[PDB]
Design an enzyme around this catalytic site. Structure first.
Site, mmCIF file in Angstrom:
data_model
loop_
_atom_site.group_PDB
_atom_site.id
_atom_site.type_symbol
_atom_site.label_atom_id
_atom_site.label_comp_id
_atom_site.label_asym_id
_atom_site.label_seq_id
_atom_site.Cartn_x
_atom_site.Cartn_y
_atom_site.Cartn_z
ATOM 1 N N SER A 1 0.798 -1.230 0.000
ATOM 2 C CA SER A 1 0.000 0.000 0.000
ATOM 3 C C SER A 1 0.823 1.267 0.000
ATOM 4 C CB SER A 1 -0.915 0.014 1.222
ATOM 5 O OG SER A 1 -1.955 -0.929 1.067
ATOM 6 N N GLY B 1 1.916 3.100 -2.455
ATOM 7 C CA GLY B 1 1.636 4.050 -3.524
ATOM 8 C C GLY B 1 2.699 4.045 -4.603
ATOM 9 N N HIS C 1 -3.795 0.701 -9.081
ATOM 10 C CA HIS C 1 -2.647 1.573 -8.819
ATOM 11 C C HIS C 1 -2.955 2.937 -9.377
ATOM 12 C CE1 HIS C 1 -0.951 -2.195 -7.815
ATOM 13 N NE2 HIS C 1 -1.222 -2.651 -9.038
#
Length: 305
Positions: A15, A17, A44
């Protein structure tokens, strides 16, 4: 011909990013080829300086490169044709002129689940012409236009000048890390990512590792030096970072979601990441800092601390 692939990987629970730094690097470096090998996932995200948003489950976030020529989906991909066609349509402005989309012949097509499809490919049933893209393309024209041969896949990689490769999930979700069976079905390591994209090892130029200040599991255990603060948010784990540094050996790190911590909070994590790296024979430094979800929120560490 070699040392031309930049590979973006997640160093924690998936998670961090990574999509933000993939889009940011694509705009800064202008790769001509972008490549990945995703299995079904939550998506994403990349948001550019103007506010346009891409939420991709199939296509790389790097399609925003101003010099885009090739979009490559590797043999390790497991994807829904319906979702691929929707993502291409949503970015038709970036993909219609002088851009080739290539699907590896042995990529897996999801029946309109992930495990059963991956297992079906591994079964290698000679009478089954409905699992790999090479075979589905013989009756589904939607992908016949993009499916290539193994020789064409190799030649496209050879013809590429600069490549951005985007890894899957995150290090601690690896099949062969300590949380098994509460993990994904593959290892989430640079070696497995290059294998699943068919990239020869000498093509690797650098690995960019992505991290968050407070890692999130989206479902599995955690490291002994972290605690919880369906999604579970955890405090930063130094042990997690040491393990990820040893295996992943990033060359540069992007530390994201710094905006949720005090200056002391995110600066202490920058220093912990570098101690973790040094402790595991890795010379990585934190180069980028993320203070928001857009291109405008990515800062150079050397400019803010």
């Amino acid at each position: 011909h070699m040392e031309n692939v930049d590979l973006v990987i997640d160093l924690q629970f998936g998670s961090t990013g990574k999509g933000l730094i993939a889009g940011y690097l694509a705009e800064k470096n202008g790769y001509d080829t972008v490549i990945n090998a995703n299995m079904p996932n939550a998506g994403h995200t990349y948001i550019n300086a103007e506010g346009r948003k891409w939420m991709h489950k199939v296509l790389p976030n790097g399609i925003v490169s101003p010099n885009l020529k090739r979009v490559m989906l590797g043999a390790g991909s497991v994807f829904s044709i319906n979702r691929l066609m929707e993502e291409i349509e949503m970015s038709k402005d970036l993909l219609h002129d002088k851009v080739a989309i290539l699907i590896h012949p042995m990529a897996t097509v999801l029946d309109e689940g992930s495990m059963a499809a991956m297992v079906e490919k591994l079964q290698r049933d000679p009478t089954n012409n409905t699992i790999v893209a090479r075979d589905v393309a013989q009756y589904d024209g939607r992908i016949a236009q993009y499916v290539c041969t193994v020789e064409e896949w190799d030649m496209a990689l050879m013809a590429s000048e600069r490549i951005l490769a985007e890894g899957a999930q995150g290090f601690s979700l690896s099949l062969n890390q300590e949380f098994y069976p509460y993990c994904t079905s593959r290892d989430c390591t640079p070696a497995r990512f290059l294998a699943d994209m068919g990239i020869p090892l000498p093509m690797l130029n650098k690995v960019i590792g992505t991290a968050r200040c407070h890692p999130i599991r989206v479902s599995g255990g955690h490291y002994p030096d972290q605690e919880e603060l369906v999604r579970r948010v955890f405090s930063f784990s130094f042990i997690q970072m040491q393990k990820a540094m040893w295996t992943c050996q990033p060359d540069e790190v992007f530390l994201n979601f710094c905006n949720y911590l005090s200056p002391m909070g995110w600066q202490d994590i920058v220093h912990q990441i570098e101690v973790a790296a040094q402790s595991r024979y890795c010379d990585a430094e934190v180069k980028y800092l993320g203070f928001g979800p857009t291109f405008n929120d990515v800062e150079l560490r050397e400019d803010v601390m």
